[PDB]
Design a protein around this ligand. Sequence first.
Ligand code: HEM
Length: 151
Amino acid sequence: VLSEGEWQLVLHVWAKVEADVAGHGQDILIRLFKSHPETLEKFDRFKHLKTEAEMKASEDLKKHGVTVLTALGAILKKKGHHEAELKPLAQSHATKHKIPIKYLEFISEAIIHVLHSRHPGDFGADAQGAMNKALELFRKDIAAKYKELGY
Ligand code: HEM
């Protein structure tokens, strides 16, 4: 369970993200796809993209990054009380999009990396640790839903 102090560190840096949702979403998905190409293959929308420049030029990718970060922000602001938000997300990702938990670990690493690059003054080690804990909680709770469903 995150402490109040940990949630403050998480939401302080997240408020900085929300100033440029789309640019963060691009950086994060591109890092994900470059660092873990298996993840790109899960996206019929995006698997035609073969270079970083093509990824950065795709408006559809930018739109999707906004969708992803908007959902994540809504979850983070619940400070753990996110059951209702995770239900549909876990269901779609387990049963329709077929995303392993490990790939959620990979996107978490990309989120952390981009936050560090964009917001170093609000993302020192204490804040990095807190954000890691928040994304771990996210994964833990999705994984329990995956297990219920047999994924
Ligand atoms: C922070 C973690 C993530 C969040 C918050 C998130 C959120 C979302 C949201 C809100 C949607 C649209 C509604 C829905 O279908 O549930 C979606 C769609 C989708 N997600 Fe995620 N997602 C996450 C991680 C991932 C990862 C790591 C992958 C793949 C490696 C993935 C693959 C997909 C796919 C394939 C779709 C459908 C895209 C389409 O064709 O329109 N998601 N995600």
